[PDB]
């Protein structure tokens, strides 16, 4: 089917420039324009601009002088570049495609790229087990999890047993600590009788720091 | 630029009820309005185009109407999968603009939390920091109190809470309260207790451990 896959999230220093790649499939950039939309806390959804089938670009007015969109039809890539970012340029950036070649009803979206504008440094998390016990087992159900501590910036992805375990998973919103680093926990409830039979692994991935950790979580 | 005003900011309904979202435009935009759904951690999903026209793959319970300045997206029988924010978009005038969204929350029966406490791991203790985690799982409604006591001393200012968005299947929330202290402070004390207060509990629930046993 139609798909748009964006490059990974990450940090950009203030007054520096942002670059995202959108790789499309299931259609040809020669037949459809690709639009760029961002979503921020301050301004919500903003349409930024578009590159059309034949290479022309339109940019939303407040961005004409710091926005550049280019593409490579053969490689099915669209390249978004935006100059001199400030803190309020922190947002989820998306590429999108309309239903028809000339229109703006966005039926296909990329997965979004969270861009953080900040002067700080990237830092991978430490992953610590939240071990099941009796103080976490009632009625035959055990709770267990992973503490994903001290990383920057957002986001971090957490899955369980390489994607095979989804039922009963809660991955909490990250909270910013006084250190300026994020921390979160991811929990799952499972039958306590399965704790000696099944392995439970939280797969943690902090793409901004290329930190991938698999943490086995065992009864203590 | 056309300004789009969505109202109210929050809607709260019970499953099976009908719900309407309003999107008003600063001047007439004909029927050039598109609606989107955003679920937790999602990108927008196109629900309706041009005020009333269906989109392939979208459940028939979604519909929209309106023309001129006053537009309405409707769900004729809400389901828990519909927990999301809803946005309108105008494209009668360049540049295309979006409204600020309406949040759709679901009501359900009271569900008391299951409470679990997790001591700090020996791994984390090697780093000189101790995190104590108190989990409140699968409850409704959102309001809850977590009180930390270390050796009967009330703990204040040294814990942080996080609440999930509403579950798309059972409409519950879960909450984590993390008490953080230095390894030195953690080693100088014995009884770690979080106390949980919730409408669904007939008295507070205390989970505790002694550092060690």
């Amino acid at each position: 089917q139609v798909q748009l896959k964006q490059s990974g999230p990450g940090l950009v220093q203030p007054s520096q420039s942002l670059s995202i790649t959108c790789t499309v499939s299931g259609f040809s950039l020669t037949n459809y324009g690709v639009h760029w939309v961002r979503q921020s806390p301050g301004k919500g959804l903003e349409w930024l601009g578009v590159i059309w089938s034949g290479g022309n670009t339109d940019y939303n007015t407040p961005f004409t002088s710091r926005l550049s969109i280019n593409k490579d039809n053969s490689k099915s890539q669209v390249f978004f570049k935006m100059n001199s970012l400030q803190s309020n340029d922190t947002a989820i950036y998306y590429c999108a495609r309309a239903l028809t070649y000339y229109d703006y009803e966005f039926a296909y979206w990329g997965q979004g790229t969270l861009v953080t504008v900040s002067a700080a440094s990237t830092k991978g998390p430490s992953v610590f087990p939240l071990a099941p016990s009796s103080k976490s087992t009632s009625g035959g159900t055990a709770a267990l999890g992973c503490l994903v501590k001290d990383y920057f910036p957002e986001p971090v992805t957490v899955s369980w047993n390489s994607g095979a375990l989804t039922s009963g998973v809660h991955t909490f919103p990250a909270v910013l600590q006084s250190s300026g680093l994020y921390s979160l926990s991811s929990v799952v409830t499972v039958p306590s009788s399965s704790l000696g039979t099944q392995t439970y692994i939280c797969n943690v991935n902090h793409k901004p720091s290329n930190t991938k950790v698999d943490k086995r979580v065992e009864p203590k | 630029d056309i300004l789009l005003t969505q109202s109210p900011v929050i809607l709260s309904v019970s499953p099976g009820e009908r719900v309407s979202f309003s999107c008003r435009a600063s001047q007439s935009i004909g029927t050039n309005i598109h609606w989107y759904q955003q679920r937790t951690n999602g990108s927008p999903r196109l629900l309706i185009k041009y005020a009333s026209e269906s989109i392939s793959g979208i459940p028939s319970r979604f519909s929209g109407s309106g023309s001129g300045t006053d537009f309405t997206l409707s769900i004729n029988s809400v389901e828990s999968e519909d927990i999301a924010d809803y946005y309108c978009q105008q494209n009668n005038n360049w540049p295309t603009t979006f409204g600020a969204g309406t949040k759709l929350e679901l009501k359900r029966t009271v569900a008391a939390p299951s409470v679990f406490i997790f001591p700090p791991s020996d791994e984390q203790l090697k780093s000189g920091t101790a995190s104590v985690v108190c989990l409140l799982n699968n409850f409704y409604p959102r309001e809850a109190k977590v009180q930390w006591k270390v050796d009967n001393a009330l703990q204040s200012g040294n814990s942080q809470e996080s609440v999930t968005e509403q579950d798309s299947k059972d409409s519950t929330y879960s909450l984590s309260s993390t008490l953080t202290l230095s390894k030195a402070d953690y080693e100088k004390h014995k009884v770690y207790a979080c106390e949980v207060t919730h409408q669904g509990l007939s008295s507070p629930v205390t989970k505790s451990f002694n550092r060690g046993e």
């Binding site: 806390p41 957002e154 | 955003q38 937790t40 949040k103 968005e165």
Partner: peptide, 12 residues
């Protein structure tokens, strides 16, 4: 309300 970058949801 206000958009939350962590959850992609409005926080009111």
């Amino acid at each position: 309300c206000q958009f939350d970058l962590s959850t992609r949801r409005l926080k009111c």
